[PDB]
Design a protein around this ligand. Structure first.
Ligand code: TG9
Ligand code: TG9
Ligand code: MG
Ligand code: MG
Ligand code: MG
Ligand code: MG
Ligand code: MG
Ligand code: MG
Lengths: 236, 5, 236, 5
């Protein structure tokens, strides 16, 4: 643990500084160090962790897609052989991406999930587990592809089951979980109808519960509801 | 790509 | 040399792929490996090298400025002591930035400059030497600050002297050199009048030589001339 | 900041 000698509070402070400086790799390393202190994470700390790794893996995914597109065009009919380099570099980025996913899943399994008893923490971490298995699934091609997909599905389903029993339909964690599980159905599981049904039902149940909210909670919930509607517009 | 958070 | 086992041509190809994927740290590592093959660089290869490291150090500089601003506010009057963390993290980013500059200067001194005999290569590398000493100067605070500043000045001056003798006043390398040396005068040497005079004279001498150019050369030169004018507008 | 290339 390269961060083992730094105070937990100092790691959290430096994660916040790294965020302001748009140094997301640093932010992720700081938050990994904080997790490895072994204490549970507060709500703010959980979101620092997720923001950091989402930005890191997001850049990797964007790069992988560029390289995968180039590689597919280099293997088309009539294309000129450019050598192993495109595949090699796509593989390099892919391996680094898988490594980030393995790291995040590792933090969740040792030992964030098993200590998370409140719905807002447990649903948050199970959503993250689904998300990072989904990123593995985006690049998976071999014997374990179906098991990787099912690992994502299983995590998202447990998170959904808890969220429906323990959170109001406008809870932003519940909403973001449903948004992302819907995308899993559409893009990973080849289940566009399930994706569309989930997005619609989530939006409608949230709409019916907005009346209970303060102005600030309303803003948080309607922001994610607009993303559900954006996806529905893309898909219908 | 579709929206996720 | 982590890239010692990869073919030169494969390193160049992967640098181009990394650029398309906006993976500038990878692009820089590939181009460092290419330089370390020991052969001179073509024009395209020189620009791949400069693009890669400019993006890397540019991100570092942007982060350093954010952190330096936070640090200065934390040391103001009436501010609440937040501990050593802001300084420590600013120092971490600063040390990484200095390391990138030391790496680029190292490539220029071993052995790109000494083998560069044509004006377009030699002026290009001496401009880079001035640029990376300037980035060191931006963060320098101790006994060697004046020597770092003078190292930048000396490199830029040699590049200017060659460029005036060997290149037309519209040459885009000559123009970019003058743009950046002007910024050195303004921001590093505390010589705003020299900065303004250099930008004006460079712009006017370029304007008078545009008539000699093709449409494509005209576009390249006028793009940089607009940056000279933008700086003059900022400064007057 | 001023422009450089
Ligand atoms: N540095 C940050 N990026 C965050 C900090 C916080 C936060 C701050 C204080 C208390 C709880 C959470 C965040 N929250 C989430 C969840 C609630 C809606 C806004 C996004 S993102
Ligand atoms: N990948 C690239 N970013 C580049 C590739 C090249 C280049 C390509 C072919 C021949 C010479 C240079 C570049 N040139 C410079 C200097 C001339 C004006 C444009 C910017 S930037
Ligand atoms: Mg302690
Ligand atoms: Mg692979
Ligand atoms: Mg259902
Ligand atoms: Mg060879
Ligand atoms: Mg220092
Ligand atoms: Mg003069």
């Amino acid at each position: 643990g390269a961060m083992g000698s730094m105070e937990r509070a100092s790691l959290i402070q430096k994660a916040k500084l790294a965020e302001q400086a748009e140094r997301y790799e640093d932010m992720a390393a700081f938050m990994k160090g904080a997790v490895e202190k072994g204490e549970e994470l507060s709500c703010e700390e959980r979101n620092l962790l997720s923001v950091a790794y989402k930005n890191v893996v997001g850049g990797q995914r964007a790069a992988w897609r560029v390289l995968s597109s180039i590689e597919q065009k280099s293997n088309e009919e009539g294309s000129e052989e450019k050598g192993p380099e495109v595949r090699e570099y796509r593989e390099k980025v892919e391996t680094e991406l898988q490594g980030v996913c393995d790291t995040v899943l590792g933090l969740l399994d040792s030992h964030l999930i098993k200590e998370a008893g409140d719905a807002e923490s447990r649903v948050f971490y199970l959503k993250m587990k689904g998300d990072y298995y989904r990123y593995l699934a985006e690049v998976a091609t071999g014997d374990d592809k179906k098991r990787i997909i099912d690992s994502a599905r299983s995590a998202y389903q447990e998170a959904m089951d808890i969220s429906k029993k323990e959170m109001p339909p406008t809870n932003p964690i519940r909403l973001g979980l449903a948004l992302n599980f819907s995308v899993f159905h559409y893009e990973i599981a080849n289940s566009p109808e399930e994706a569309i049904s989930l997005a619609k039902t989530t939006f409608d149940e949230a709409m019916a519960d907005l009346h209970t909210l303060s102005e600030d909670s309303y803003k948080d919930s309607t922001l994610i509801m607009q993303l559900l509607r954006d996806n529905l517009t893309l898909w219908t | 790509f579709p929206a996720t958070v």
